[PDB]
């Protein structure tokens, strides 16, 4: 009752609690520690933990050392660490060695470490053992087996299944590496250890090692960093190339991009020489793709055109991919997509898109749009959307025949069965922009001299031809489920083109637009109507409302 009253008094009033008042109560606590009643000892230990967290005098510190020895005897008597008395004794000793300058015997501390060593794996018991270990580390007491404890914590780091235990072991291992003095060979062994565990069977273990090396890169001195950072960059490039986990690969890219500015000029020059080496070794396609990805990451990290020779080599590789980027090319589709992403990044970072060489790059982008891969087609569509705005700012603007060919490529992408939603929306926006440009220039439909259809043109204008192609693609039903989103995007683009085009052109293309629209509109009160068919019918109704607003 007295202990509970005292606990309530200090836990309720903090201003009333003073150092001078409780100095008389401390001997009653050291006398109550010897009590056989477990509740009495536990309440005494709560109050004693609070009083150690509070500041006191030298005599009170001596009584605290007495309490520490009695608590150590309690720990020896308690047979399991799961026991509440043993747990509260561990809390007491952790708070004692945290907030008191007095220390126990090293043999006693070693004994407590030996008891709490198995607890570091199990999630139920790990927190208190790690509290004790963190207190010992922060007070920096030197023990013979603390190095083996650190090895155990790095094993827990790599292999443990629990994220919280991995994080706390990471904190303990980091504190041990930063604070505790070690041999140079031991430190080099630890760094080679981290680099080796970057290639680990468990993706969670790899990610934990990556967070540890992230802390190393952030808090490390640059002089000590660079000698490690060479092998770090090599291994991180290996992970970003060869790891099965896309999250791990993205984290490797992020870690490399974070380590690049902190790296010294010599390390950046070595990395740029390596980038030039993988880019020049163009015999292996995946090797060149890894070089191009590394060059793009280095450009995004350090800035555009930091190394003019490396930028020129990457541009030459991209030009080689554009020269061989048609259907049936030897280059991989993933390599072509990576080259397209690098070219998009270079066009974003540079004004070189206006040049005639980048006009050949845009021709290669048109070839990449003709390429059957969906990701490459989407990248080419994004490049075409950029070049739509950049074409007026370009030295040589895109021709009307080139715009018609781009619209034909967009129509081919729409008529393709499988298309991404973002790619379909991009194609609809590009078709709307091309229709607006054709309406502004009054450009008629263009037929190539080399490739003649042999009949009269169905539509007089290029915008009318695009609208007729969109209507035909919407009306086509070879794969109704796959092309449903394409038909919805084509209906939206037809509404946009009806809004953009002139009223006479809208009146001319109204029949062609309504012909795909009347297909869903003809079916009324269908017994089994598809949800995609109903959505297409709603889009066709919206397009018909837009057409009725345009023309009475």
């Amino acid at each position: 009752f007295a202990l509970d009253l005292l606990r309530n008094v200090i836990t309720r009033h903090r201003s009333f609690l003073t150092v001078s008042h409780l100095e008389g109560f401390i001997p009653f606590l050291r006398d109550s520690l010897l009590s056989e009643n477990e509740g009495v000892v536990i309440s005494t230990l709560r109050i004693l933990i609070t009083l150690i967290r509070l500041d006191f005098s030298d005599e009170s510190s001596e009584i605290f050392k007495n309490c520490a020895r009695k608590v150590l005897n309690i720990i020896k008597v308690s047979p399991s660490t799961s026991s509440e008395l043993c747990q509260m004794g561990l809390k007491f000793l952790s708070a004692f060695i945290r907030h008191t300058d007095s220390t126990l015997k090293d043999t006693a501390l070693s004994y407590v470490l030996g008891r709490v060593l198995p607890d570091l794996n199990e999630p139920s018991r790990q927190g208190l053992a790690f509290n004790f270990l963190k207190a010992l580390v922060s007070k920096h007491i030197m023990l013979p087996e603390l190095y083996d404890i650190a090895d155990t914590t790095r094993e827990i780091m790599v292999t443990n299944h629990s994220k919280e235990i991995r994080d706390v072991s990471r904190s303990v291992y980091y504190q041990f590496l930063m604070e505790y003095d070690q041999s140079k060979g031991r430190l080099e062994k630890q760094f080679k250890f981290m680099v080796d565990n970057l290639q680990y069977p468990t993706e969670s273990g790899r990610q934990s090692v990556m967070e540890l090396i992230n802390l190393i890169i952030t808090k490390a001195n640059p002089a000590l960093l660079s000698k490690l950072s060479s092998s770090f960059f090599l291994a991180l490039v290996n992970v970003s190339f060869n790891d099965d986990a896309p999250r791990c690969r993205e984290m490797a890219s992020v870690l490399i991009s974070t380590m690049l500015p902190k790296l010294e000029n010599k390390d950046l020059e070595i990395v740029e020489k390596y980038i030039a080496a993988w880019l020049k070794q163009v015999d292996n396609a995946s090797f060149l793709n890894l070089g191009l990805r590394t060059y793009k990451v280095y450009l995004k990290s350090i800035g555009f055109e930091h190394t003019i020779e490396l930028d020129e080599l990457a541009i030459k590789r991209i030009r080689y991919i554009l020269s061989d980027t048609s259907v049936g090319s030897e280059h991989q589709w993933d390599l072509v997509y990576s080259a397209l992403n690098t070219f998009s990044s270079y066009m974003e970072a540079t004004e070189s898109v206006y040049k005639h060489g980048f006009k050949d790059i845009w021709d290669g982008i048109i070839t990449c749009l003709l390429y059957p891969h969906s990701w490459v087609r989407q990248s080419a569509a994004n490049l075409v959307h950029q070049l739509i705005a950049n074409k007026d700012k370009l030295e040589i603007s895109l021709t009307n025949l080139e715009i018609q060919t781009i619209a034909t490529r967009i129509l081919h992408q729409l008529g393709a069965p499988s298309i991404p939603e973002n790619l379909a929306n991009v194609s609809i926006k590009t078709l709307v922009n091309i229709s607006i440009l054709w309406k502004e220039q009054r450009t008629p439909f263009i037929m190539d001299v080399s490739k003649q259809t042999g009949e009269d043109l169905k539509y007089t204008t290029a915008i009318d031809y695009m609208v007729t192609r969109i209507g035909g693609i919407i009306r086509s039903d070879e794969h109704r489920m796959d092309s449903f989103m394409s038909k919805k995007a084509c209906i939206q683009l037809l509404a946009l083109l009806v809004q953009v085009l002139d009223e006479d052109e809208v009146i001319a293309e109204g029949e062609k637009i309504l012909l795909p629209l009347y297909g869903y509109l003809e079916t009324y009160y269908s017994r089994a109507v598809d949800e995609e068919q109903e959505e297409l019918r709603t889009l066709s109704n919206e397009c018909l409302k837009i057409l009725e607003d345009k023309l009475q």
Partner: protein, 68 residues
């Protein structure tokens, strides 16, 4: 995405060898090693069984001193 794109896997040792400068390979001393990565942990019973086999060999070597 590049992470979504598949690897044609290339070895880290292959990249270090394809690096032309031997000075770079000398500077990347932490990369060169005896491959000290951890194995996946065994089940606890199996690991204890291996530890007990090791203890058996140590005990036999200690007690064969009395044979003379």
């Amino acid at each position: 995405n590049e992470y979504v794109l598949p690897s044609g896997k290339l070895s880290l040792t292959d990249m270090m060898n394809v690096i032309d400068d031997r000075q770079v390979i000398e500077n990347a001393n932490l990369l060169k090693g005896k491959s000290s990565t951890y194995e996946v942990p065994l089940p606890q019973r199996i690991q204890q069984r291996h530890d007990r086999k090791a203890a058996y060999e140590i005990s036999r070597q200690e007690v064969s001193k009395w044979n003379d």
